[PDB]
Symmetry: C5
Subunit: 346 residues, 5 copies
Amino acid sequence: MSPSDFLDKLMGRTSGYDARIRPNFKGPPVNVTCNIFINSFGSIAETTMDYRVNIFLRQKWNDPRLAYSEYPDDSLDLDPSMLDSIWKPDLFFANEKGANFHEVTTDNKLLRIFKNGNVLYSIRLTLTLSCPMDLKNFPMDVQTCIMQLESFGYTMNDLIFEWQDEAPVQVAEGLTLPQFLLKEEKDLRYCTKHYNTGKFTCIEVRFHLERQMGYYLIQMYIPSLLIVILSWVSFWINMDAAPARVALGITTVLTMTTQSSGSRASLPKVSYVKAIDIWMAVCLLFVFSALLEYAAVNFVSRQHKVFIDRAKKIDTISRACFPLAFLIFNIFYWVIYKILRHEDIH
Amino acid sequence: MSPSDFLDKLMGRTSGYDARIRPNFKGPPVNVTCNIFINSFGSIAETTMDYRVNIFLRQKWNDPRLAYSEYPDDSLDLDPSMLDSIWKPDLFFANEKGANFHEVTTDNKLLRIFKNGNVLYSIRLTLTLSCPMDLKNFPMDVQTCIMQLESFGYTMNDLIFEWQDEAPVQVAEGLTLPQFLLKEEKDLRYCTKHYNTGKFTCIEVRFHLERQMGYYLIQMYIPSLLIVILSWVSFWINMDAAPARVALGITTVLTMTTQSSGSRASLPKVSYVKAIDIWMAVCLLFVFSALLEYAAVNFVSRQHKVFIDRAKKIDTISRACFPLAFLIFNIFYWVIYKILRHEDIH
Amino acid sequence: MSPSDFLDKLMGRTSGYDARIRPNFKGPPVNVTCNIFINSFGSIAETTMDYRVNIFLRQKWNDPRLAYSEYPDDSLDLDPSMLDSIWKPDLFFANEKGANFHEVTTDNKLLRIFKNGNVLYSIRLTLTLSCPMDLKNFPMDVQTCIMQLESFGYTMNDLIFEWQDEAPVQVAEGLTLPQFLLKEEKDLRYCTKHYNTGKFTCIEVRFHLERQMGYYLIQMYIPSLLIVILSWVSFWINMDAAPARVALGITTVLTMTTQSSGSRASLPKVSYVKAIDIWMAVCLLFVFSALLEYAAVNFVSRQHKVFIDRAKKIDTISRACFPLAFLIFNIFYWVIYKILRHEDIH
Amino acid sequence: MSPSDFLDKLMGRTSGYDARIRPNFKGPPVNVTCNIFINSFGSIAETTMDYRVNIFLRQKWNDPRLAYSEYPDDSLDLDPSMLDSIWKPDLFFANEKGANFHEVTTDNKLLRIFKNGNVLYSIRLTLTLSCPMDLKNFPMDVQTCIMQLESFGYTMNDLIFEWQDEAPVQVAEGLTLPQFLLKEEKDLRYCTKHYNTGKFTCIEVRFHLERQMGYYLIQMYIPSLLIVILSWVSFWINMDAAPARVALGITTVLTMTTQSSGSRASLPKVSYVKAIDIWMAVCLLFVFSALLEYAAVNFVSRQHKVFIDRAKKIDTISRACFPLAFLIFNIFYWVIYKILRHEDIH
Amino acid sequence: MSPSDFLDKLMGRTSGYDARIRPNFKGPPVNVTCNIFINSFGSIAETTMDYRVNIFLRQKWNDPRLAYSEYPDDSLDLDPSMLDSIWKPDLFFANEKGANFHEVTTDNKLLRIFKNGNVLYSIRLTLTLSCPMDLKNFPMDVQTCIMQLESFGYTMNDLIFEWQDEAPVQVAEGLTLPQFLLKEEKDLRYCTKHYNTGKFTCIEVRFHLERQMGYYLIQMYIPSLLIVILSWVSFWINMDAAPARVALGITTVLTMTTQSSGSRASLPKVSYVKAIDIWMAVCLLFVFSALLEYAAVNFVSRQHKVFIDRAKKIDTISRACFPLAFLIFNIFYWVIYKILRHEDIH
Ligand SMILES: *[C@@H]1O[C@H](CO)[C@@H](O[C@@H]2O[C@H](CO)[C@@H](O)[C@H](O)[C@H]2NC(C)=O)[C@H](O)[C@H]1NC(C)=O
Ligand SMILES: *[C@@H]1O[C@H](CO)[C@@H](O[C@@H]2O[C@H](CO)[C@@H](O)[C@H](O)[C@H]2NC(C)=O)[C@H](O)[C@H]1NC(C)=O
Ligand SMILES: *[C@@H]1O[C@H](CO)[C@@H](O[C@@H]2O[C@H](CO)[C@@H](O)[C@H](O)[C@H]2NC(C)=O)[C@H](O)[C@H]1NC(C)=O
Ligand SMILES: *[C@@H]1O[C@H](CO)[C@@H](O[C@@H]2O[C@H](CO)[C@@H](O)[C@H](O)[C@H]2NC(C)=O)[C@H](O)[C@H]1NC(C)=O
Ligand SMILES: *[C@@H]1O[C@H](CO)[C@@H](O[C@@H]2O[C@H](CO)[C@@H](O)[C@H](O)[C@H]2NC(C)=O)[C@H](O)[C@H]1NC(C)=O
Ligand SMILES: [Zn+2]
Ligand SMILES: [Zn+2]
Ligand SMILES: [Zn+2]
Ligand SMILES: [Zn+2]
Ligand SMILES: [Zn+2]
Ligand SMILES: [Zn+2]
Ligand SMILES: [Zn+2]
Ligand SMILES: [Zn+2]
Ligand SMILES: [Zn+2]
Ligand SMILES: [Zn+2]
């Protein structure tokens, strides 16, 4: 025939096609097979508990009214503007905060109609999805980001969503994240929303992201350790140098206070302790105990010669005991925090 | 019949339906039963005095012109695009700063028409609602967020809003807030706007949110207490160490000044004192009195031996009196601030 | 008759009504009576010199072509969607930076047509209006925010704007501002724009806002005073304690420098001095003169015993003279700044 | 006749008017006379190198097909909605980053048709125009902001842009800028874009803006000078006070480092030196040389009495030489920077 | 003929033209020749790993159905509004985060139809393109920004994209960047996307940008060097001045810590070391070793005269060895970092 006539013949007034009626109106529910292709991944903000994604959302379903045989071609890669003249599933993202299409030059849309009536519907989307994050074990945590594909108007008696058996989630090659590693395996679950308006279909993916500790070591693990070592210099400073040892205790304690507040600058105001909070608390306790060590030496040395060697013994004991107890803490902290991270994500 | 014909028969030119006319035009006012489902809750900013919500707004009313009997089906879950061909209430949010719909894939809308003429109208909305906050008792406060549903064009003689008798407000399971606890009980009030243009219907919910103090203890309650203890080390420092005790008083006072200004960084510029302001003022008064204590010891010790034991007596008295008076203040501050919080929200 | 027929009969093709023609086309100019209702007030930013408002804009004018008598009803509260089929004034805000309507559920619009032809047109608007601010006397200033309602296309020969005789401006009950007090009285002026395109009508309101000083006292008035008192401790510190008195002068001067820069953090980069700048300059001069006082005592004490009592006399004189001169400055500063604020706003 | 009939008679199907055809299709090019009225000016950000303006753009051209004689009126101030039914020039701004119209109540548009066929077309626009800035001589610089009005689709053979002979640029009375002075004179140039698609018309204005130095004197010129004077106190401090003079050198050098980094906080990361960078570098060199002066006095004083008066001579020489050399630098810096600013803008 | 009739004759119902059908429907694929003109370049943010561009995108292809001979004119520069009535390629940008058109006064679009059927289609676009950046060698790095032009709906059997043989990329004259130099040469590659939906055409440019080091030298290369020199003053400070040398070591170490954290303020949280991180680590190691040098001198000097000249020998050796080893590090650091930058970009 001609390319234009076939398009407006299969659907329209002459054929009787109605886009407001689901394909099998009073029969079995429509089964929509979905699969996504992640084009980009980033903007993971813990303060707002969300992340931004850019995906190619593909949907496959069978429409018996769109089946054709006369036209010679097998598939039919048609124009996007007609997408309003056909029935489409009312998919929506349950945990979506913001979303939009793309019209950079034309509509970033695709539609194919096969001979048997199968419809492939691909679309480009930018999504801002909410992600509740557990920040206990914060510099060393594995977050799980979810993506729920839910129907809004049709129940399970009308619309059912299914993930493709092969490759429901595909990630673009070379897609890296500056802060996390995206695990190769993905979890495909079966959500089902139960409202007072009825039952609604839902499908869900889970992405596992491990936080990289290279930034946090050079940002607040090594500089705080350096402050603890800098506090240990006072044990070798001469005893009568009171403005020297006291200023050494003070600058280290106040710096540890500012570094402790600086470790939560980019984090939400949660109300539970974290692993970095435990490390900051122990380092602050160590520098404060070093200052209390000199406050005791300064008090013991003036009680009037037993008191000259008794105060010097505290300095000699603190020279070896302060790094040994800090090493024992470092062993227990790092070992138990590399033990909890081997726990299964599931 | 056929699915398409019934939809355009009940309403349209042939039936005579007009979407610009309320159902009972010159009779009793239309009663709209409303109930909301909170999908997300967050973005509670004290600086802008607002919070962001994402709800499913359901509206129920009876339209006698939409009653049908011939079609076999009980309910009629129809397509959203037709929503312009029917009459809908002109609901609007009185305390709304910004609002928008959702069109992530299709319209996030739902409409059902029953046999008797009842219309269920569900919609997805993102709202930025203004919330006036009282920050007296700030680290330990219970805020009340409101949501007013008001008609804009119709008076009480035409439109009346009512909350559903069962479950007007439903919260999604597992919805947590990083900063607040959402109380299970909700207050359903009856606002009524009186303008010079007439009387207008209004309904209102109240959400009670208790601020969690876990963040604020580790952020500005314990570090300021540590500065007060660090200031108490000077009482044990040797008397003639003037650059040591003076630098101890100075660094503690200047740090208390910076922490006091740091406690109001994320707060609006209100003009009344708060509980954290009282705590910061007392801690600043304590470290400043410790420095004045050494300024008196340094002045008394040089008046030329009575003056050697008289100045030492002030040090010995301040060693026990400074923590005892600080403990008495801590008891009165915490007790009275755990007494005011047991006061009923209502 | 029927409700629908009357609406499309009064205006349309059959009646001959044209929305592109002003009511009295070649007669007296159309007089539009305007009055606003402020729903919210806030977002007053000095850096961008603007403020955000949310108002109900009401407009009243007479259209002889819309007069009816046959229909029984007195007023006619009709549907908003028809608002395009009638003539409306081309009002616009002269000092508007950004503006938008509201479509949270439906159009936030209202239109009534009376028997004689009077048209009441209410609309909801969010406005970001520019406000030039004079920040001399900044912590204690009264700003005047303006709102100009101007016609864009019609001259005085066609369109005239007037304020309602009773209640042109109404403020919602309980509307408070965290930073300012909104004065109860308002000024209704008569602007008139003179361009090269002709003469254009304009009406203007003026809002008077007094800045509350409760925040600024605890933020940068009392902490700077505390630094000045902390600088006065050096006069009581022992004379030979050079690292003590010198470090006392240095930390106070550098802190006064940081507080002076901190007082202009949220302010625009204006090029005239302010009241807080005068207070910061005098406090910085006081702490710098205290350090120069010890620099003179340290120089006088070593000139080799007259020089021992001569240097001690400067300390004794500075003990009483430094707070007395600071008290005299505080009296003159506060008195003259409570005198300028009693000056009439007009 | 009637007002409505004339509007649709001059243009439309009956007359044969086509909005897709330029007035003189195959004759001389259309000459469009342009003039702008600046309503607001601000948001000048050096980091993004742009500024925001709000203008009334007026365009005048002759359309022979719009000439009328029968209708009685001289000019014809018509309704804005019809603006799509006539031909308009395809003006666009070459250096525009973002732009939008205004629809606060209606379209902020104006169109007049005269008897001879002249068309006056006024529109309200908000523009974010890019401005390349030269920041050498930064606290004391005169920037030149440009505005290019270019045609996008028509060449010089079809469309020519011209500035009005009288008042091409008019500024609203009382329009001030918090950071700059807008020079009264303006430069009207003749740009002409040469692409591979052909030749295109362009016209350009230039605004000269002088930066006000009142903010920068009190922000980083006087506080850095105060640090230099504070560093000169060490020359009067006693020689053996090593922790006093050393702490005086250290706090001044570290403060000069922080003030130097603070001077470029709101500036883009350019790679050439500026006048404030030269001032910061010389002030940092002065305080660092004062510390090296005490490092030399402390080294010379202990070489074992010639060495007691030799080290004291360096202190006495540095007491007068350090302010004299700083005064000579201040004279040469300010004189040459008030000489370069008298250079013609052109 | 007449200008209007020809436009609607070549395409439309009478001619049979369909915009939903590609020109050669069942023949060879359509070859689209593309070339871009960069109007502006900037907003290069490393934190979000993106950059903003403003380009003129030109597309050339042959449409046999648009060939004409009767009309006299060679080319046909027509009106933009008709652009919907013709077939256009479905180009889209693969690495695009956000994009929009421009409608400042009219559509910023251009279309020309030649006699043989060639179509030139120019459009103005603002793009926010993602750019993965390697920040190893960060203050001295050459980034490569890419721009992929990909088809969304048509495969290689239908649509093929090609770069123009002459001048695919043209940069506007005088276009400078405050932070980078845009290399004159550009790389034109051949991407080809392989999805599960089929094969898709793609073309790609590469821009090479060299970071300018003028800002980073005065921002964090020279101030850190000054801290290292300031730490070398302690070697000349007198030995028994313990509060002087200790405070000199402390302020320098804490300042180096704050400058090290300040060097990564505007950078993303990557987990690999950079060149500035290596420089900051070595400078921190140098000032910390200077403090350990005085901690050893202070310990050796009190062991009770051999111990008086033995501790003085460490001071004399450290006076020359500390700058010599720092000079050797500076030679190896700068030489190897000027060697890696001569490596070919390709
Ligand atoms: C959609 O999928 C469901 C589930 O596989 C199909 O329902 C089954 O259909 C088969 C074929 O008639 C029956 O034998 C089963 O008993 C059905 N199971 C259930 C639970 O209903 C359904 O037919 C599919 N829809 C379409 C249009 O093919
Ligand atoms: C909407 O609700 C109101 C209040 O219940 C109804 O008004 C009452 O209607 C009953 C039934 O006719 C009367 O007996 C009462 O006297 C009415 N009370 C008032 C205060 O008006 C109203 O009828 C309802 N509207 C509809 C359409 O059912
Ligand atoms: C709009 O208001 C103006 C001013 O009150 C009216 O103009 C006056 O109209 C009266 C009644 O005819 C005359 O007596 C006056 O001489 C007019 N004054 C001026 C300055 O024109 C005008 O008529 C009003 N418009 C309408 C439609 O009522
Ligand atoms: C637009 O302006 C140009 C330049 O003034 C006009 O071109 C001139 O027209 C006059 C009158 O016919 C001629 O004598 C000149 O030789 C023309 N000069 C050039 C360079 O073309 C043009 O006619 C104007 N267009 C209209 C419609 O008036
Ligand atoms: C688009 O370009 C391709 C590649 O040059 C063209 O394909 C070639 O066409 C010539 C001419 O018929 C043949 O001789 C070659 O064998 C073709 N090569 C391939 C790989 O197909 C194609 O014809 C061009 N399309 C149009 C419409 O001109
Ligand atoms: Zn896009
Ligand atoms: Zn898993
Ligand atoms: Zn959405
Ligand atoms: Zn309650
Ligand atoms: Zn709204
Ligand atoms: Zn007034
Ligand atoms: Zn506007
Ligand atoms: Zn000029
Ligand atoms: Zn634009
Ligand atoms: Zn290359």
